[PDB]
């Protein structure tokens, strides 16, 4: 899953 601490919460894995 997306790591909101390192990348957008709606990243490609969302």
């Amino acid at each position, epitope marked *: *899953r*997306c*790591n909101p*601490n*390192m990348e*957008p919460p709606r990243c*490609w*894995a969302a």
Partner: antibody
Amino acid sequence: EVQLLQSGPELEKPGASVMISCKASGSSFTGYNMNWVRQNIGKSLEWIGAIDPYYGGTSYNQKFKGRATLTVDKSSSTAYMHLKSLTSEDSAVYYCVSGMEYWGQGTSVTVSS
Amino acid sequence: DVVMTQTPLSLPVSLGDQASISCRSSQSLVHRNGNTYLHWYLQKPGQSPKLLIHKVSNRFSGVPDRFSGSGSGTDFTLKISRVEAEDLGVYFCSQSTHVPPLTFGAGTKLELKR
């Protein structure tokens, strides 16, 4: 505290393939994506790709041209990176990186005839 | 892809000195969602990299106060207020605003003066 254990040093011939594993434990996981990054002799870092352990989706660095294949074995908390059509350029230390926070110990890959 | 340029490439210091490392990105790393995904890692000799700072200025778990990140847009700086021996190594910035691919600077080597 994610602990990531990588498989050992690999030696392959030009044209061949290599598969490296990364065993995740801790700590522990929030199920973050597993990334793979290599580091060449010059110490520069190149991101290869990432896979989501949950639904299995992936994002690849286009520059690898699909030579790279990331998989997860959910049943064993193990991630894998497979790289084909190896050349000397691909000689590097390969790291798995959980959610871009925690790095494995690295796997040396030497491509040589 | 976003090119990350770090300077200087090598930085000699004495223990106790303040040290400062810069990272410039070829594009703004401010995401549409208003966050800036600029991060800093340290790789000690013989080891794997470890995360120090995320999203510009947030110290990662276990990272001491002497490390501080700042900057915005395309200009960023990691400062160490009083250098310790355990701090010597290669510092890399990375960005995950514009991906794929995630990208890294080429690294800055913090070394000891004599």
